Design an enzyme around this catalytic site. Structure first.
Site, PDB file in Angstrom:
ATOM      1  N   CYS A   1       5.470   2.508   3.734  1.00 14.97           N
ATOM      2  CA  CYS A   1       4.483   2.988   2.762  1.00 14.97           C
ATOM      3  C   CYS A   1       3.695   4.139   3.355  1.00 14.97           C
ATOM      4  CB  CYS A   1       3.508   1.873   2.349  1.00 14.97           C
ATOM      5  SG  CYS A   1       2.188   2.470   1.241  1.00 14.97           S
TER       6      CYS A   1
ATOM      7  N   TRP B   1      -1.469   4.281  -6.878  1.00 18.38           N
ATOM      8  CA  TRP B   1      -1.275   5.440  -7.729  1.00 18.38           C
ATOM      9  C   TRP B   1      -0.071   6.235  -7.207  1.00 18.38           C
ATOM     10  CZ3 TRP B   1      -5.998   4.682  -5.102  1.00 18.38           C
ATOM     11  CH2 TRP B   1      -6.130   5.414  -3.913  1.00 18.38           C
TER      12      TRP B   1
ATOM     13  N   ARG C   1      -0.805   4.272   3.201  1.00 17.71           N
ATOM     14  CA  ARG C   1      -1.545   3.190   3.836  1.00 17.71           C
ATOM     15  C   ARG C   1      -2.918   3.586   4.354  1.00 17.71           C
ATOM     16  NH1 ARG C   1       2.273   0.951   8.246  1.00 17.71           N
ATOM     17  NH2 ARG C   1       3.462   2.879   7.795  1.00 17.71           N
TER      18      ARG C   1
ATOM     19  N   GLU D   1       7.731  10.603  -6.511  1.00 18.05           N
ATOM     20  CA  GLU D   1       8.316   9.370  -7.028  1.00 18.05           C
ATOM     21  C   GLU D   1       8.805   9.557  -8.458  1.00 18.05           C
ATOM     22  OE1 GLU D   1       6.329   5.545  -5.540  1.00 18.05           O
ATOM     23  OE2 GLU D   1       4.694   6.988  -5.358  1.00 18.05           O
TER      24      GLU D   1
HETATM   25  C1  HEM Z   1      -2.508   3.840  -3.329  1.00 19.99           C
HETATM   26  C2  HEM Z   1      -1.516   4.735  -3.353  1.00 19.99           C
HETATM   27  C3  HEM Z   1      -0.107   4.434  -2.787  1.00 19.99           C
HETATM   28  C4  HEM Z   1       0.796   5.393  -2.590  1.00 19.99           C
HETATM   29  C5  HEM Z   1       0.591   6.900  -2.865  1.00 19.99           C
HETATM   30  C6  HEM Z   1       1.991   4.771  -2.066  1.00 19.99           C
HETATM   31  C7  HEM Z   1       3.133   5.453  -1.749  1.00 19.99           C
HETATM   32  C8  HEM Z   1       4.325   4.852  -1.469  1.00 19.99           C
HETATM   33  C9  HEM Z   1       5.630   5.470  -1.548  1.00 19.99           C
HETATM   34  C10 HEM Z   1       5.896   6.923  -1.997  1.00 19.99           C
HETATM   35  C11 HEM Z   1       6.516   4.550  -1.143  1.00 19.99           C
HETATM   36  C12 HEM Z   1       8.034   4.733  -1.111  1.00 19.99           C
HETATM   37  C13 HEM Z   1       8.348   4.555  -2.596  1.00 19.99           C
HETATM   38  C14 HEM Z   1       9.788   4.736  -2.947  1.00 19.99           C
HETATM   39  O1  HEM Z   1      10.362   5.801  -2.628  1.00 19.99           O
HETATM   40  O2  HEM Z   1      10.335   3.802  -3.577  1.00 19.99           O
HETATM   41  C15 HEM Z   1       5.809   3.311  -0.831  1.00 19.99           C
HETATM   42  C16 HEM Z   1       6.342   2.128  -0.369  1.00 19.99           C
HETATM   43  C17 HEM Z   1       5.692   0.908  -0.300  1.00 19.99           C
HETATM   44  N1  HEM Z   1       4.379   0.670  -0.682  1.00 19.99           N
HETATM   45 FE1  HEM Z   1       2.975   2.066  -0.955  1.00 19.99          FE
HETATM   46  N2  HEM Z   1       1.792   3.394  -1.960  1.00 19.99           N
HETATM   47  C18 HEM Z   1       0.491   3.154  -2.407  1.00 19.99           C
HETATM   48  C19 HEM Z   1      -0.109   1.907  -2.503  1.00 19.99           C
HETATM   49  C20 HEM Z   1       0.428   0.700  -2.141  1.00 19.99           C
HETATM   50  C21 HEM Z   1      -0.206  -0.609  -2.292  1.00 19.99           C
HETATM   51  C22 HEM Z   1      -1.589  -0.831  -2.958  1.00 19.99           C
HETATM   52  C23 HEM Z   1       0.640  -1.530  -1.806  1.00 19.99           C
HETATM   53  C24 HEM Z   1       0.481  -3.066  -1.683  1.00 19.99           C
HETATM   54  C25 HEM Z   1      -0.721  -3.681  -1.751  1.00 19.99           C
HETATM   55  C26 HEM Z   1       1.822  -0.817  -1.307  1.00 19.99           C
HETATM   56  C27 HEM Z   1       2.935  -1.361  -0.718  1.00 19.99           C
HETATM   57  C28 HEM Z   1       4.108  -0.678  -0.448  1.00 19.99           C
HETATM   58  C29 HEM Z   1       5.299  -1.278   0.098  1.00 19.99           C
HETATM   59  C30 HEM Z   1       5.473  -2.760   0.504  1.00 19.99           C
HETATM   60  C31 HEM Z   1       6.242  -0.333   0.202  1.00 19.99           C
HETATM   61  C32 HEM Z   1       7.660  -0.598   0.764  1.00 19.99           C
HETATM   62  C33 HEM Z   1       8.631  -0.695  -0.395  1.00 19.99           C
HETATM   63  C34 HEM Z   1       9.974  -1.211   0.051  1.00 19.99           C
HETATM   64  O3  HEM Z   1      10.130  -1.695   1.203  1.00 19.99           O
HETATM   65  O4  HEM Z   1      10.910  -1.140  -0.777  1.00 19.99           O
HETATM   66  N3  HEM Z   1       1.649   0.519  -1.546  1.00 19.99           N
HETATM   67  N4  HEM Z   1       4.480   3.567  -1.022  1.00 19.99           N
HETATM   68  N1  LIG Z   2      18.474  -2.161  -6.561  1.00 23.40           N
HETATM   69  C1  LIG Z   2      19.035  -0.970  -6.889  1.00 23.40           C
HETATM   70  C2  LIG Z   2      20.198  -0.947  -7.653  1.00 23.40           C
HETATM   71  C3  LIG Z   2      20.772   0.273  -7.991  1.00 23.40           C
HETATM   72  C4  LIG Z   2      20.176   1.450  -7.555  1.00 23.40           C
HETATM   73  C5  LIG Z   2      19.014   1.390  -6.791  1.00 23.40           C
HETATM   74  C6  LIG Z   2      18.381   2.684  -6.327  1.00 23.40           C
HETATM   75  N2  LIG Z   2      17.430   2.429  -5.234  1.00 23.40           N
HETATM   76  C7  LIG Z   2      16.076   2.229  -5.779  1.00 23.40           C
HETATM   77  C8  LIG Z   2      15.071   2.245  -4.633  1.00 23.40           C
HETATM   78  O1  LIG Z   2      13.751   2.257  -5.166  1.00 23.40           O
HETATM   79  C9  LIG Z   2      12.825   1.377  -4.674  1.00 23.40           C
HETATM   80  C10 LIG Z   2      13.256   0.306  -3.899  1.00 23.40           C
HETATM   81  C11 LIG Z   2      12.324  -0.593  -3.402  1.00 23.40           C
HETATM   82  C12 LIG Z   2      10.972  -0.416  -3.681  1.00 23.40           C
HETATM   83  C13 LIG Z   2      10.538   0.644  -4.463  1.00 23.40           C
HETATM   84  O2  LIG Z   2       9.193   0.780  -4.701  1.00 23.40           O
HETATM   85  C14 LIG Z   2       8.370   0.661  -3.545  1.00 23.40           C
HETATM   86  C15 LIG Z   2       6.920   0.920  -3.824  1.00 23.40           C
HETATM   87  C16 LIG Z   2       6.012  -0.094  -3.583  1.00 23.40           C
HETATM   88  C17 LIG Z   2       4.663   0.108  -3.834  1.00 23.40           C
HETATM   89  C18 LIG Z   2       4.219   1.333  -4.294  1.00 23.40           C
HETATM   90  C19 LIG Z   2       2.870   1.524  -4.538  1.00 23.40           C
HETATM   91  C20 LIG Z   2       2.439   2.757  -5.002  1.00 23.40           C
HETATM   92  C21 LIG Z   2       3.364   3.782  -5.207  1.00 23.40           C
HETATM   93  N3  LIG Z   2       2.950   4.997  -5.657  1.00 23.40           N
HETATM   94  N4  LIG Z   2       4.673   3.552  -4.968  1.00 23.40           N
HETATM   95  C22 LIG Z   2       5.121   2.362  -4.515  1.00 23.40           C
HETATM   96  C23 LIG Z   2       6.478   2.156  -4.282  1.00 23.40           C
HETATM   97  C24 LIG Z   2      11.472   1.545  -4.963  1.00 23.40           C
HETATM   98  N5  LIG Z   2      18.467   0.188  -6.476  1.00 23.40           N
END
Ligand code: HEM
Ligand SMILES: Nc1cccc(CNCCOc2cccc(OCc3ccc4ccc(N)nc4c3)c2)n1
Ligand code: HEM
Ligand SMILES: Nc1cccc(CNCCOc2cccc(OCc3ccc4ccc(N)nc4c3)c2)n1
Ligand SMILES: C[C@H](O)[C@H](O)[C@H]1CNc2nc(N)[nH]c(=O)c2N1
Ligand SMILES: C[C@H](O)[C@H](O)[C@H]1CNc2nc(N)[nH]c(=O)c2N1
Ligand SMILES: [Zn+2]
Lengths: 411, 411
Positions: free
Chosen positions: B108, B280, B111, B285
């Site tokens: 993330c 947010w 953070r 994204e």
């Molecule tokens: C507040 C603004 C936040 C921003 C801008 C942000 C940004 C991001 C981005 C860009 C990713 C990668 C997303 C992707 O490509 O799928 C990510 C991953 C992640 N975010 Fe954040 N995030 C935010 C808040 C949070 C919050 C509030 C939480 C939990 C309380 C959180 C938990 C996570 C986790 C666990 C991942 C890992 C996802 C995975 O392993 O698939 N995020 N974040």
């Molecule tokens: N299964 C499958 C099946 C077919 C294709 C795909 C493509 N692969 C998708 C990957 O995409 C992801 C994967 C895991 C998590 C995710 O979200 C993470 C996340 C968490 C919290 C956030 C808080 C704020 C913010 N702004 N962003 C956040 C993003 C996306 N996958």
């Protein structure tokens, strides 16, 4: 323990068994991943040399489908006897060519490896002086340049013996532009090469002090002090950078050289260490337009380009750098292509690499690959490698980093 | 044992000791790196050591380690485990745990905000209707009329695995996708499978391109139930471009609140299988992945056509050009409507500052370069040149299998 890699764009799944042939260590553990560390990690004893030679000759003779033949066992005995006595051994030409091609094949950070078997190997193991090294390197440069129809090549100088008689090319690449610190603040030329440029000046080189001064070669043979040589300019092919839509782009006065020829790495084959092995291919456009031009610690031209485009540079959220970055890279590709100099774009190279990965999994059982380096430095997710899982592991023969010689050399 | 990471653009070096606190395994070994692999019922036996580890960390953080309150809590939890086979967190412990699961999320980039998380305790929830109510209040609080606020809502923890709470949606707000008979897809291709489940559960699909999906909520192991989020709680932004008047005519829009709802939160060995959280958006994204991934809306070509780019060959970088413009339009539309968003330049710069602060006050910051580096313009952001160490700390957010693959249907 027969690992699988999935492509999340296409769901294609490949099964990797090649990694079980891996020998060296990655630097990671089960508790920490060092996949984004740039660098983990004297003479070899008579002991560890023979297992290294046997492993290498084993793969060589399997590849010519003569594993466990008269020739195989005879060669194995032959090398065994030479090590026993001389405490080293010499590779046959055939084994030298095979080992060099496979150090490229095994370079997990190289997106260009679909070409690995079309490598021209120049055996320079008979070289004794820096003048001789200069001769071999001019011939490499001329052959590789081929008037813009670039050809991959490596030139291999004598192997390390006792560590006191190393051959070294002190340049990091055969062709690079000089860098000068200004008496007031900034940097003229290439900032990456400022210390090397000063070593060359602090050595006799009369620097023209321009933006694009081709650096001299600084060549070390048999452990002696290095010697300066000027590459003949007709051998240095360069491309003036212009833009297919913006006329003012020419007026920026940018060019770059056609031949990327890395010269500071160490080639390891069957335990033998080739400390001087300059190799060359052709550029991926982003190597120049993204890194060489727009890294903050490099030419750092993003500012003026965006100005000449009259972009709102007052806030990052206008994405003015992203817009400028794209136009710069359009220009680099347009200029090389217009001058008939070989170059590949990042979309074409990454698509080639996915095909190469498929081939290697099919015919070889795997392909070691370092996602952090394979994904291009712009537009990552719209290239196919972004969505490709990759397994990284260390196979031999290999290219390795080695220290800069001016930190080691007894002057 | 100390470990160093280097920023290669600034030469700033940091020293990590926090990795010694790491319990879980990374998937890598000394011989293979799984750094680019997307993903590499608990008895009283293994639970008290997990609880004790968590309570030690908790009481350290409030500067009461070894206090009588600490030792009494430990005894209380021990007796509760051996007598009930689980235990209940105090409200203070739940809040600390949720914040540190975010603080520890090595993928993330956002953070820096970790300590400003609004924690809603929904552990008294018993039915899907109750889950719907808690989730509506979360969406309303989090959206805050566009001034987005980070929040998490925590439903009851797992007991025997037969009574799980789950949100079947992957995010609280997402658009439907429909596979047509001719092979084309209407809406968001990422959501085709979930959309089909919803329709099979009785959802009447509008069959449009931007249909907000219903909530599919599972309480206490019962069959999941459908609910429609009140449309006035779903803030959406029409996507337009500040220079391209024709961009509005693509008909695109996106929702303001990114709210991930399929992860599992682990705290002191307890498993919260339903814990939707929201923050947010970072612009990329939506504008790189959601719109330009080939397996998503995939509007690159229509934007390239309307820009009249050379789409014949890839080396014109028409895709790169269209991608920047789409991402300009996403950021412009959100800022114009006063909906919180952050560009990838600002977010990566904040992350570096966050990371350095964590190294000073915490001794490290686990970070996954493969995920931290943005999906466009990677090397002109400061994280690209930043070495990172990846390791697993708890409390954590984990992946879990989709519920339709494991749920036992009541009928
Ligand atoms: C507040 C603004 C936040 C921003 C801008 C942000 C940004 C991001 C981005 C860009 C990713 C990668 C997303 C992707 O490509 O799928 C990510 C991953 C992640 N975010 Fe954040 N995030 C935010 C808040 C949070 C919050 C509030 C939480 C939990 C309380 C959180 C938990 C996570 C986790 C666990 C991942 C890992 C996802 C995975 O392993 O698939 N995020 N974040
Ligand atoms: N299964 C499958 C099946 C077919 C294709 C795909 C493509 N692969 C998708 C990957 O995409 C992801 C994967 C895991 C998590 C995710 O979200 C993470 C996340 C968490 C919290 C956030 C808080 C704020 C913010 N702004 N962003 C956040 C993003 C996306 N996958
Ligand atoms: C022929 C076209 C080639 C292309 C387009 C190509 C492309 C690339 C690129 C873009 C990189 C990343 C380097 C950076 O970002 O600075 C790389 C790494 C590398 N290339 Fe290739 N390459 C080519 C040929 C070769 C050849 C002929 C060799 C050796 C025989 C080679 C060996 C390597 C090695 C060892 C690395 C990684 C160096 C390291 O570990 O730091 N490449 N390549
Ligand atoms: N040490 C240092 C010191 C200061 C700053 C930096 C910048 N941070 C990484 C520098 O970058 C590298 C690193 C290592 C190797 C390298 O070159 C590899 C290479 C090899 C063959 C090629 C063939 C064709 C082609 N087109 N490209 C090639 C690139 C660059 N580094
Ligand atoms: C194969 C690869 O691991 C996968 O595509 C990853 C790459 N890096 C990523 N980075 C982010 N932020 N989000 C992602 O979904 C991914 N996907
Ligand atoms: C910090 C990080 O390891 C370093 O910047 C790496 C990242 N990825 C790279 N990828 C390529 N192709 N070339 C590089 O020099 C680097 N540098
Ligand atoms: Zn690893």
């Amino acid at each position: 323990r027969f690992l699988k890699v999935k492509n999340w764009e296409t769901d294609v799944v490949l099964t990797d068994t090649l990694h079980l042939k891996s020998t060296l260590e990655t630097g990671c553990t089960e508790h920490i991943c060092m996949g984004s560390i740039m660098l983990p990690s004297d003479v070899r004893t008579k002991d560890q040399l023979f297992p290294l030679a046997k492993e290498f000759l084993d793969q060589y003779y399997s590849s010519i489908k003569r594993f466990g033949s008269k020739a195989h066992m005879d060669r194995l005995e032959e090398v065994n006897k030479e090590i026993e006595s001389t405490s080293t051994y010499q590779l046959k030409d055939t084994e030298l060519i095979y080992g060099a091609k496979h150090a490229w094949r095994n370079a997990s950070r190289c997106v260009g490896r679909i070409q690995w078997s079309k490598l021209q190997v120049f055996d320079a193991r008979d070289c004794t002086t820096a003048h001789g090294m200069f001769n071999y390197i001019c011939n490499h440069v001329k052959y590789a340049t081929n008037k813009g129809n670039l050809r991959s090549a490596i030139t291999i100088f004598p192997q390390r013996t006792d560590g006191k008689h190393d051959f070294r090319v002190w340049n990091s690449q055969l062709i690079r532009y000089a860098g000068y610190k200004q008496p007031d603040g900034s940097t003229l030329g290439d900032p990456a090469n400022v210390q090397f440029t000063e070593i060359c000046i602090q050595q006799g080189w009369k620097a023209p002090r321009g933006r694009f001064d081709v650096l001299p070669l600084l060549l070390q043979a048999n452990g002696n002090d290095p010697e300066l040589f000027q590459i003949p300019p007709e051998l240095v092919l360069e491309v003036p950078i212009r833009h297919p839509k913006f006329d003012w782009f020419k007026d920026l006065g940018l060019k770059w050289y056609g031949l990327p020829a890395v010269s500071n790495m160490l080639l390891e084959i069957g335990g033998l260490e080739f400390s001087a092995c300059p190799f060359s291919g052709w550029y991926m456009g982003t190597e120049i337009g993204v890194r060489d031009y727009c890294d903050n610690s490099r030419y750092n031209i993003l500012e003026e380009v965006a100005k000449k485009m009259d972009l709102d540079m007052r806030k990052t959220s206008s994405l003015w750098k992203d817009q400028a970055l794209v136009e710069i890279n359009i220009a680099v590709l347009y200029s090389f292509q217009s001058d008939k100099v070989t170059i590949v774009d990042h979309h074409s190279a990454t698509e080639s690499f996915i095909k190469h990965m498929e081939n290697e999994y099919r015919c070889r059982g795997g392909c070691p690959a370092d996602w952090v380096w394979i994904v291009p430095p712009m537009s990552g997710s719209i290239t196919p490698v972004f969505h490709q899982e990759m397994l990284n592991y260390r196979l031999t023969p290999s290219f390795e980093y080695q220290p800069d010689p001016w930190n080691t050399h007894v002057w």
